[PDB]
Amino acid sequence: SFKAAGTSGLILKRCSEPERYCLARLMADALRGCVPAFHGVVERDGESYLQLQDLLDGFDGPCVLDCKMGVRTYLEEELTKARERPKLRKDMYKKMLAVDPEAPTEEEHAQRAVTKPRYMQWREGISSSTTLGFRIEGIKKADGSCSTDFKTTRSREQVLRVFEEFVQGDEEVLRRYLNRLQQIRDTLEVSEFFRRHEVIGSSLLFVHDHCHRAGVWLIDFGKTTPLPDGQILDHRRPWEEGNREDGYLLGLDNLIGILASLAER
Ligand SMILES: O=P(O)(O)O[C@H]1[C@H](O)[C@@H](OP(=O)(O)O)[C@H](OP(=O)(O)O)[C@@H](OP(=O)(O)O)[C@H]1O
Ligand SMILES: Nc1ncnc2c1ncn2[C@@H]1O[C@H](COP(=O)(O)OP(=O)(O)O)[C@@H](O)[C@H]1O
Ligand SMILES: [Mn+2]
Secondary structure (H helix, E strand, O other): OEEEOOOOOEEEEEOOHHHHHHHHHHOOOHHHHHOOOEEEEEEOOOOEEEEEEOOOOOOOOOEEEEEEEOOOOOOOHHHHHHHHOOOOEHHHHHHHHHHOOOOOOHHHHHHOOEOHHHHHHHHHHHOOHHHHOEEEEEEEOOOOOEEOOOOOOOOHHHHHHHHHHHHOOOHHHHHHHHHHHHHHHHHHHHOHHHHOEEEEOOEEEEEEOOOOOEEEEEEOOOEEEEOOOOOOOOOOOOOOOOOOOOOHHHHHHHHHHHHHHHHOO
């Protein structure tokens, strides 16, 4: 979804309505500093783009880790959609045989295809999302090396070992990350945006360099949606269809915990 901007320090992202609505709101919220600066929409190839701060500007050869936050990674309306009018996905099927050949049902196999919520619930359960409320999605590196090979990274200790490898023994980065996550947690807990929105499919982006510069920002507000009038979430309690709960803060709590653990090793 990304394209280079004509201005130093910025990046363009393909405009989507929910995300655009979210960024505008966030620029006036307690979370303003916890997300990339949003500077408006622009037109390029007859196409609209979010004009964003490039979070990597300011770092020297940045290392990047994307952590998808939440116990739930799809909207409830996708559950409704799958029950009234399912669109079978043959792609979402072939991976399941790869990760776990006994995972698809006898019927899914005959279909060679799976619904969206089903595929997503299974991803949640073989990774750490269901149990810890986040998961690692990818790492991008200063050495050029990228990896998304984290589909079965699930246990507390597997997660810890990915971060241990990502920070490469830099106590100052790790310290800075933890200070940033504590301050983000504090912000989320008083944010008016956060208590009025179900935050699904967003990530915390960790960015550090060999100069010990470290930052974290929330990104990807494409599936982040306002709750019905005057309704709010606690972002910790289990999701049950109907309640719209995302377990975002369960995730954050556990992530902080794992980092604090790592720092004491
Ligand atoms: O990560 P894998 O296991 O491949 O599954 C992907 C991701 O969950 C996507 O989220 P993200 O883009 O954050 O990676 C999701 O996009 P949505 O944001 O549209 O839910 C895709 O759904 P489809 O777009 O329906 O394929 C789904 O196929
Ligand atoms: N504002 C930003 N500045 C620099 N890099 C970004 C920024 N936002 C996202 N990225 C990079 O691009 C990746 C995907 O961003 P994301 O918002 O999840 O887009 P999408 O849902 O279209 O994949 C991130 O994991 C990160 O590596
Ligand atoms: Mn994404």
